[PDB]
Amino acid sequence: MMDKFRMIFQFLQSNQESFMNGICGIMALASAQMYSAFDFNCPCLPGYNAAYSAGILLAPPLVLFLLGLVMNNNVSMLAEEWKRPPGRRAKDPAVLRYMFCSMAQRALWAPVVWVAVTLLDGKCFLCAFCTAVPVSALGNGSLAPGLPAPELARLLARVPCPEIYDGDWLLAREVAVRYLRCISQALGWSFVLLTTLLAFVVRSVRPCFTQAAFLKSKYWSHYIDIERKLFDETCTEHAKAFAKVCIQQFFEAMNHDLELGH
Amino acid sequence: MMDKFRMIFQFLQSNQESFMNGICGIMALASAQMYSAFDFNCPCLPGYNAAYSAGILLAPPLVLFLLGLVMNNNVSMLAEEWKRPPGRRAKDPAVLRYMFCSMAQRALWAPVVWVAVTLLDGKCFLCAFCTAVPVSALGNGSLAPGLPAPELARLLARVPCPEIYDGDWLLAREVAVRYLRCISQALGWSFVLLTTLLAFVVRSVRPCFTQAAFLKSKYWSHYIDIERKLFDETCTEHAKAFAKVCIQQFFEAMNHDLELGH
Amino acid sequence: MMDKFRMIFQFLQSNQESFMNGICGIMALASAQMYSAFDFNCPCLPGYNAAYSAGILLAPPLVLFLLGLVMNNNVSMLAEEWKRPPGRRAKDPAVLRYMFCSMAQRALWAPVVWVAVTLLDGKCFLCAFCTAVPVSALGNGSLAPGLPAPELARLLARVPCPEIYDGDWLLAREVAVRYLRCISQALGWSFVLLTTLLAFVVRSVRPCFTQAAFLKSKYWSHYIDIERKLFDETCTEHAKAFAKVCIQQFFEAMNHDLELGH
Amino acid sequence: MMDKFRMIFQFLQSNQESFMNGICGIMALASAQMYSAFDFNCPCLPGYNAAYSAGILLAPPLVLFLLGLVMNNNVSMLAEEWKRPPGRRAKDPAVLRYMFCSMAQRALWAPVVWVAVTLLDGKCFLCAFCTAVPVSALGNGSLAPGLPAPELARLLARVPCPEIYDGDWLLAREVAVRYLRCISQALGWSFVLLTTLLAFVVRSVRPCFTQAAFLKSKYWSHYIDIERKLFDETCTEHAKAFAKVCIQQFFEAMNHDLELGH
Amino acid sequence: MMDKFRMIFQFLQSNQESFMNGICGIMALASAQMYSAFDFNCPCLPGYNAAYSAGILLAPPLVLFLLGLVMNNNVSMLAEEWKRPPGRRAKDPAVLRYMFCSMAQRALWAPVVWVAVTLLDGKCFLCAFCTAVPVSALGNGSLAPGLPAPELARLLARVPCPEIYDGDWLLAREVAVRYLRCISQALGWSFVLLTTLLAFVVRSVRPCFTQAAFLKSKYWSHYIDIERKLFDETCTEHAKAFAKVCIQQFFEAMNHDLELGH
Amino acid sequence: MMDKFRMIFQFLQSNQESFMNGICGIMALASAQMYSAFDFNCPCLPGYNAAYSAGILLAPPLVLFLLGLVMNNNVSMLAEEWKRPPGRRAKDPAVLRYMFCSMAQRALWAPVVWVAVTLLDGKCFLCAFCTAVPVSALGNGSLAPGLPAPELARLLARVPCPEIYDGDWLLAREVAVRYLRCISQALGWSFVLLTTLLAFVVRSVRPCFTQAAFLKSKYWSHYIDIERKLFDETCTEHAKAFAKVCIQQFFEAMNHDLELGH
């Protein structure tokens, strides 16, 4: 099971060449790996499955999203100037609208890798649709020998839980699995395809790439840096002149000498 | 079992990019790992469980909290100036109230990771509510064949202790477990979700972020640095002039020469 | 199974000598390895195979292609100046046609390694043509003992799925496999041969290598570098003169002194 | 068993950020690990246990304490000036009392980690109170079938020694253990809690933190450094002028030439 | 199986001392290792073998050859000036003939290591001549008990495929193998001997080592370096004077000020 | 089997202190290790052995010898000036005879380590003299019960091939082996002794150590270095003045401007 995460492990061990997305690589690479040690096991009960599996395609994604906004050091400047009234805003809506949108496209790198990499291994999908398999399809001389609706859902639904499987009635194990891990791995490619193709279009066309506001932004965020870095200079400077008055008082103020004079 | 902690192990091995929270990463990453080598095993007795399990969601958290306050080098300055009377305080309540509050939000990074990572593996929860499972639910032709209340609590309660399990009466093992590790992993996400969302709000709104007092603080804590660093200069300086009087006395004072003169 | 990817692992660990193709080595080396942890298992059903196997020779290639264009920092400049009308284009079609073509030949290094390295191991090919093997050829006293067409496709088609194989009727297992992994490894060489030989011709002849436009290009792309790098200078410069007016106001504006004066 | 010590192993491997306590980390981290390779096995005899177990909560702690005082380079200066008569002491009792007390709180970091980490694994506690377990409690249809007092102590007392356990009479093995490793791990938390909370109070209040004597101390210990470092200068200086008289005598004193002159 | 390639692995890990051949060591060392992970398994059918084995002594060699020419940065200069007409060639045939020949003797280091290291392990040779072994030689009381020609080729030919071997008729397994891995390892030495001895003669005698043309060559290839390296200087220089006119326009052109003036 | 080569592996990993022999350590250390992965297995047939074993004490040595001459960068200078006529030789026979002899004593470090390290493990010797063992010596109640000459050579000769050994007739296995690995390891020491002792004599006496010609040599080989290193200076110098005439033509020659002028 180490394969899905040990890969980025040496890849992390490989080099130190990246960007903000590589800074996102600090987190989401763990998201490529955090799946590995976090186990998965479904109740194999009659109706809980379709509830439970939807838990592991919506919450842990949404967590990794919101942990992207708070993680970067900008939201206050947008949060601060939004709550204030219009007019008083020292920034145009344009620089707001852009700079707000350039937070999403750096956050979305985690919650798409953690929807691929829990489809390609199918576990998330297996416990979610096993209740409705066409049992007549490849059923070893099938025909549903008088089987009812209840007490068959409790027959099908165990399929992922291996050692507690009921038996050969209208199914083997290795044909009900290994046919739901096929359909799953079809979505996993026909999903990641559509997303990356939609990564094309975005850059390639447009949405708030105006040469005007891009300039004002990068100027501004560059300006906050020099402000913080420079304020410390005046403090340490202005403080240095102030310590000399007091520290000297400790000297010449205990005994004006040492008793250890030989 | 190495997975839960070997992950941060290479992640620790990964790089050296962090902050005070990464300084908290020095500790709490161990808290992500300290769970790994510290075993867990419940008494599997009739009433001790619900006592014992609450031991491992309140004490070891609270320890990691208080080890956060004492660990950082500020509490004296707050502790010193609080015990003194008002008026004599060389600092406003504002700089107190802020600087005191900026100790919590750096300490709380340990005691939330050690409440998630002992819910997602369910062991802490399993030995805490096994005494009340609905045995009729998925009970293999159930009906409670005349079973009493006592001598059934001692029947259910063994469920986590594997090799000492009684038997198939109104239960298998792999259906009483693997249904309490489902409910547990639901809290683990619906908890970590709520917390991180509440990490949003805090930064995003406010609570003592006033531009006034933030300034006075960082100036002040910057000032203590130069004071300590500069005091050593005068000492080593003032001492250097003093050693010359005595060290010379050792010379010219033993024999004023060596007998080894050839 | 680590062999196919652990090789580039130490090879990655080997040194840091490469180029843009070695920059492509950042990705496609993973493509040499990403096959390793991504499992493969075919439905072993009557007609799905020839559908499913074609999934793993066209989609995951095409993904690695489009992830090559978006990955490099040029497509905007081509995308921007293409949507505009002719005439307004500040660049000749020649520099366009070349610079556009020099994106393909840096992208095609991934989608040819991931068509070799899923033929040489034959798994992709095995589940794709097992339905039509000449069963009379090496069939252990063959003759098709009255076997029909249906209920034989479901007999042949299981061949890759080992533990669920039907039996010795007109076949053993280790002669239906180990004869489709021969034919496969013949394409894998007679393919990679043809491609590399076609890598010869390209460089060796020509296609838009004109000394004129190559010059204008590398000049231009060199020019964008100095523009971005130099703009930051004026900002940090022009900003530095501006901070001094405000930062001084914080000083001399809180109390014009400290109450901690002893 | 490597877990309890392999953790600090990579943690030691982690970084090199610490202080005098981290210098104590040089030793006590081994004390976190020295437990690992030093085995434990109790006599499983009738009365020796309660003797023997008390051996491994008092001696190996007390050793790690005294190895803390001697390890640091100060005790002579306190030991030297204590044996002398009062009055002649070149230092006030205050600087003595403080500087003596600042040896304990750097030594106590070892003998509290080696009392936690041999309670949380319970082995030290198991062989110490097995002689008195309430056998009627969870005793598999108990009632003490005429069992005497002697020849039952020799029945209970074997409980930790696994392969030499007598048998099922009024006990199984996995219920007499796994109920004494519960009670133990309760002290281990309710102990480490109380200690760390008492680490709060100490810093937070007081005990010889007077601004007067703290100054004189750190000045003094700073002074011993420059004295030792500077004495070597005069020696190597004063010696250099002295060697020239003799070393020249070796030259011009063997033959005033070489016979190898060609 | 790691031995054949893990050797160069630490040898690669050993040091970084080599030349263009060591640059070829970048590739062919993989060719010493690429054999390791690329499996081998022959059809064990009547006539395909002698076809199939010849596949793995001619194609994968020839690939590693052509990947040597394209890999080095010279073929264009030869390819460019060859297609042109004679007379216009700015270079003598001598510098052509030499410089063209000094491409082969740097490429031939891969396709001789991959013909040795797939003879010394004999697998390539075993599946190629098993159809004609003298069965009477060491045949355990032989005599060919009426065996025909067909239905014996299908008897011999299975010999490499271990678990599907027919049986003891006129052969054991461990005497038909372990006599074709002897004859093979004889060629492997009597081949590598002849080649290295022919490496002697080449250097030691001659073939286009003329002092005249060697000079003109190394001068020329040295000249292309300074040309490329120096062209970038004029560009970045000539561009720097050009950016100042436009970048200033962005300034003073948005608002000529900031609205954030307090 | 890793022991014979894993030793030099960490020894190689040990340090980087050596000379030309250590440069030979680059190769022959592999020769100490190349034995490890190159298998050995003898035909166990009646007469081929004494042929085959002599293959692995003469060819692979002789290869490592000739790979020593060609490997070092001197043979041309000797090869060039030997083919020429006497008189024209710019070097005395003395400097020739010495410099030629100082190639052997740097090459002979490989072909003596690969004759020791395939005697001390005896495999090379076992398959070479098993055909003539005194079977009466330690033969478990021997006497040769009417055994003929043929059909006994095929009885003895299998001895190294373990699983195909015939049986107990006049021999066990573990007494025919483990008496030919004794005699072998006697030569291995009484050989390496004689060689190293002959390494004494050589240095210690003489053979072309004349102070005259040693001087002329090391001067000469020192001179070739400065010649090659210095020639590149004039080229890059003389070329730099030449590029400026042409590179400027590319500028001012495409359009004398850019159309992108805004």
Side-chain angles (χ1 to χ4, degrees), chain A residues 34-51:
Chain A
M34 285 154 173
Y35 173 81
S36 297
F38 170 73
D39 201 328
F40 202 100
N41 45 354
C42 46
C44 49
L45 265 295
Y48 281 16
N49 305 3

Side-chain angles (χ1 to χ4, degrees), chain C residues 22 25 28 30-137 139 141 144-159:
Chain C
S31 174
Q33 303 181 19
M34 285 154 173
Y35 173 81
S36 297
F38 170 73
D39 201 328
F40 202 100
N41 45 354
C42 46
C44 49
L45 265 295
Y48 281 16
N49 305 3
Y52 168 64
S53 197
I56 312 310
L57 293 182
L58 295 185
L62 201 149
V63 163
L64 271 177
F65 181 41
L66 262 53
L67 193 69
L69 292 179
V70 167
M71 188 64 109
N72 58 50
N73 55 6
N74 278 14
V75 68
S76 81
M77 321 305 165
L78 171 148
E80 282 184 340
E81 273 72 349
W82 193 97
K83 222 61 184 171
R84 300 168 169 178
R88 295 186 178 187
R89 47 213 197 180
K91 320 189 161 183
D92 189 288
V95 53
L96 280 192
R97 162 170 74 254
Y98 171 82
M99 166 90 91
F100 179 43
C101 170
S102 171
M103 284 283 81
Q105 273 64 359
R106 189 161 301 111
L108 265 282
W109 185 70
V112 164
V113 160
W114 212 79
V115 160
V117 193
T118 191
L119 278 201
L120 301 202
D121 304 5
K123 286 179 174 179
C124 176
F125 190 80
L126 182 44
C127 304
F129 278 118
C130 201
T131 175
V133 160
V135 57
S136 42
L147 279 301
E151 294 324 276
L152 169 136
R154 283 206 319 181
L155 267 294
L156 274 301
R158 283 197 172 70
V159 156

Side-chain angles (χ1 to χ4, degrees), chain F residues 33-98:
Chain F
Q33 303 181 19
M34 285 154 173
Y35 173 81
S36 297
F38 170 73
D39 201 328
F40 202 100
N41 45 354
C42 46
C44 49
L45 265 295
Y48 281 16
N49 305 3
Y52 168 64
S53 197
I56 312 310
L57 293 182
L58 295 185
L62 201 149
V63 163
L64 271 177
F65 181 41
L66 262 53
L67 193 69
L69 292 179
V70 167
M71 188 64 109
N72 58 51
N73 55 6
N74 278 14
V75 68
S76 81
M77 321 305 165
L78 171 148
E80 282 184 340
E81 273 72 349
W82 193 97
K83 222 61 184 171
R84 300 168 169 178
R88 295 186 178 187
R89 47 213 197 180
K91 320 189 161 183
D92 189 288
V95 53
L96 280 192
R97 162 170 74 254
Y98 171 82

